[PDB]
RNA sequence: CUACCCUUGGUCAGGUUGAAGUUCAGGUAACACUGAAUGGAGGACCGAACCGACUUACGUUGAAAAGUGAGCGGAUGAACU
RNA sequence: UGAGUAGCGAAAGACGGGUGAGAAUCCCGUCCACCGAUUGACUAAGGUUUCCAGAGGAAGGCUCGUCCGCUCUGGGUUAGUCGGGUCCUAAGCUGAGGCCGACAGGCGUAGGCGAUGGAUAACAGGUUGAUAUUCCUGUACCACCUAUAUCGAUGGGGGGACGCAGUAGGAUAGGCGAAGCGUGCGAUUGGAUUGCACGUCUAAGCAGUAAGGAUCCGGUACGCUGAGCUGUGAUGGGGAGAAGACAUUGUGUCUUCGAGUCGUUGAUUUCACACUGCCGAGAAAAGCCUCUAGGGUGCCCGUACCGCAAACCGACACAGGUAGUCAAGAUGAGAAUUCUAAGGUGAGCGAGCGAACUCUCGUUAAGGAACUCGGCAAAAUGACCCCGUAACUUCGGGAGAAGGGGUGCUCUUUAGGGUCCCAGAAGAGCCGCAGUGAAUAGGCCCAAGCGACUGUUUAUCAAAAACACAGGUCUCUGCUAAACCGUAAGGUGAUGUAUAGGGGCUGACGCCUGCCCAGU
RNA sequence: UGAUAUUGAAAUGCUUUCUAACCCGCACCACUUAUCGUGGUGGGAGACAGUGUCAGGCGGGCAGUUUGA
């Protein structure tokens, strides 16, 4: 659910937040709580080394397991909480030995889930099985890359990705990019979408809120000298003036593909993106 | 109006004394050309 | 041991309180359990306590060069019988 | 000293406005609309400390290598230290 | 030389008596004047002997100096409990092995160092020219040692342990007006039911108290801790407005002796991140508790002094800068305004005269912006309580729109409120030129341009129509991501995973965004 | 971007397959109640990548200079 503000005041004027009405416990639990100290975009040399990072709200790392290896033990979950390092809740479960853990939150969920290998209590959300046990057209999310690593695909908020048909070894995966591509089959999975689907419908209001998560100012290139950015110089407004729009360090920065993600990689790729 | 130096003990035997010189390899040359000109104060 | 160096005859400071109280320039690096047993074996007295501060080098002593004195330490004992620890 | 950042502390007489929500009423199959209390939001309003430097007069072998007087802006925040 | 010329650094002093070779300038005194959310009191940096007493007057002091933050000679800093170490760890630095590298060396694991934070046993009064939870008196507290079932970790678990904003409450400190004591009862007309000034007192130890909450262990499922404040004593103690007794103004002073302490009214910015709400989701480790595997002793550093300043940073005894704690009375929203208290201060050149001219300040006939680039600058409005209030609008606003009225004191009657204190109605009357009688605190309106808004900038000629901005759009990026530093190791991105990250342009909101892919 | 070394084994120079090389900011175990590292096991990839010598192309991102009388 989505709070409209009323236009008390410029700055509140045209703002939207979230309603916070799944979010039971509102108290993070302790003893899965590690410090996080803030770094600014620094390398280890000290420098900053991405732009437009610093400052923000003080947080607490959650410690989240994407590996879901139980062997077929239960779990009740518990609450559904605030996180705020990313943008899906979490979820306190309970296992039946005595563990507790957070999982990244489904959307629906308080029901009560297994972290299985097959379909014994069969396919449903929360569940996270390997994949050759997954039937063919279904939404899972939070896919692994690599066996036993844990998840790293369709981690964020209102994300998914549905599997295609097999290979005997693979499986193919429509990623939420609109990419298909082959994962290993022994990659565990877990079932459903991710929750918090109104995550991208929020207008953050005014130029300090943007500014406690941690953002800062970005300026134009354009309003810079000859000899901070290619686009620099001139007199009066001035427009583009080269070929191509460039980056700060002397790059096409609008159409050139930047494709070296991986090579051996690339035969596991079967599509482009729609994106 | 403010001016440039502040005196403080802590950051001046901290960025130059005799230790901080002794630490590095160009503070020993430091030292090492303070001693042949007879310097009666080699860091502080 | 001799860690005590000197009394120190001054005017109040070590006059007004020399119905119990002496005063010496001792040695600079030790305790007052030290001077608290040097006292006791040399005048084979009972000292009830033991006081110690340290002063400065100043700078006072200037003639054509200027220069600074010595820093020195000075112990103040409390006697708990016995007497005559400076003259 | 100055610019950003990290960590961990500190300060911001007073006074005034009255958002969401809640609660009584009433109105409907209902939601849900009008009223009255309660609530106390906000890069909100006035204004000292505090931080600034818009106009002007003075000074210009200056009191001072950038200040003073009179007014002026912010003053719970993208604050100041 | 300029030339006995410019200046002598914000400001109230006057006289009396001393000392002395010499006095506006030094000491003592009375009157006057200034600050008093500070020029007063205490401390962190930083200075580093500048602090005190006795002497001095060559140089320093913007004059003088018999004086001093200056010269000489002797002194002054006292801890089991205060701030640091023998306890802990942020950020960061360092790093045995280790990885990378022409050399030098860069990075990094275990481990270590490290506060601005966490833990940790003492309070009143007295005393010196100079120390003061440190010395002394009184009363305490903690750790260890010796005499006359327990211990449980280098390991597991709990706790420690936390944001911002809003009111409602309990109690207290401090504030004030009567009574109770202790001194005064008069100048110049008057009075004597009159005028002043003081009211307590600690920690620790005992009571009771608003409020507020399937390793014996932890996790799964099937009356308890703590807690401001009060009170008995501690305290036949200490102190004190002052009172009576002793020698050289005993100036004064040592000395013993003995006095009140009661109830009430408002009320913290101190005493709970407690309770409620919100989104931006609010350190770590030890001390501590817990479960199992098993009559004495008490150390080192600091301590004086200045600390909004003549002692620190500004070359100066320099109108600037400098973190934090305390916070009186009348008036009031109040840490504003004016006058004062505690306490400090009279600013290191004066005496004349009262020209031109410059600077700061007050007033002005008649008119009124005519001045001039330009109502710049100044004047005008300004407080509270009442009526009243337009086009427009994103329905919040504009709006303190605009425009008007009231305001002192005395006396009468007269429903309030809190528990002496706070708030009102109406009527009758007195006065002057004047009633927020001083200080202080909006001029407003009609239209156009730019930028939506709060914010930021050329430290010392520019503060804006510039930068930022929420929102729009395009584009690279499938995770050892792209991008970036190094261009090695290692890193940021991110302990994130396409509703996510980097780059380019535009710049809230409303209506919209035409055609062309020659050519780069 | 190509040739050559590290670099092999097979079947229809180009193709397809295998695995021991080389690699894994993948999992588990031991040094060690660190995992930086080393080693050892399972999995993934596999003669490809990474690296060395040689050669062609883009390269105001950076450098040195020129721009007459």
Same mark, same amino acid.
């Given at each position: ?52 990072? #610093? &400052? #923000? ?85 939070? =896919? ?28 193919? =995966? ?61 007199? &009066? ?39 | ?44 | ?6 009394? @120190? ?40 306590? @033991? ?37």
């Amino acid at each position: 659910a989505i709070k409209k503000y009323k236009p008390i005041t410029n700055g509140r004027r045209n703002m939207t937040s979230l309603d916070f009405a799944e979010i039971t416990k509102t108290t993070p639990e302790k003893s899965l709580l590690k410090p996080l100290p803030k770094k600014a975009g620094r390398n280890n040399q000290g420098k900053l080394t991405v732009r437009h990072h #610093g &400052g #923000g709200h003080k947080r607490q790392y959650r410690v989240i397991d994407f590996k879901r290896n139980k062997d077929g033990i239960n779990a009740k979950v518990d609450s559904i909480q605030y996180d705020p390092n990313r943008s899906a809740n979490i979820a306190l479960v309970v296992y039946a030995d005595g563990e507790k853990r957070y999982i990244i939150a489904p959307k629906g969920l308080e029901v009560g889930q297994i972290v299985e290998s097959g379909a014994e209590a069969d396919i449903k959300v929360g569940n996270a099985l390997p994949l050759q046990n997954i039937p063919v057209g279904t939404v899972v999310h939070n =896919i692994e890359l690599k066996p036993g690593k844990g998840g790293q695909i369709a981690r964020s908020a209102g994300a998914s990705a549905q599997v295609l048909g097999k290979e005997g070894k693979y499986v193919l =995966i429509r990623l939420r990019s609109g990419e298909v591509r082959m994962i290993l089959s022994t990659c565990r999975a877990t079932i459903g979408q991710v929750g918090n689907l109104q995550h991208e419908l929020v207008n953050v209001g005014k130029a300090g809120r943007s500014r406690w998560k941690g953002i800062r100012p970005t300026v134009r290139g354009s309003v810079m000298n000859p000899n901070d950015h290619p686009h620099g110089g001139g007199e &009066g407004r001035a427009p583009i003036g080269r070929p191509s729009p460039m980056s700060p360090w002397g790059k096409p920065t609008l159409g050139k593909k930047t494709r070296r993600g991986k090579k051996s990689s690339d035969k596991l790729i079967v599509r482009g993106r729609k994106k | 109006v403010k001016r440039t130096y502040q005196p403080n003990k802590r950051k001046h035997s901290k960025v130059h004394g005799f230790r901080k010189r002794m630490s590095t390899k160009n503070g020993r040359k430091v030292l090492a050309r303070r001693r042949r000109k007879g310097r009666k104060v080699l860091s502080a | 041991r001799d860690i005590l160096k000197r009394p @120190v005859i001054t005017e109040k400071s070590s006059e007004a309180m020399a119905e119990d109280k002496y005063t010496f320039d001792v040695d600079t690096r030790v305790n007052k359990t030290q001077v608290k047993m040097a006292v006791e074996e040399i005048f084979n007295v009972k000292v009830a306590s @033991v006081n110690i501060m340290n002063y400065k080098p100043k700078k006072k002593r200037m003639g054509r060069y200027q220069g600074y004195t010595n820093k020195r330490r000075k112990a103040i004992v409390t006697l708990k019988e016995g007497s005559d620890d400076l003259f």
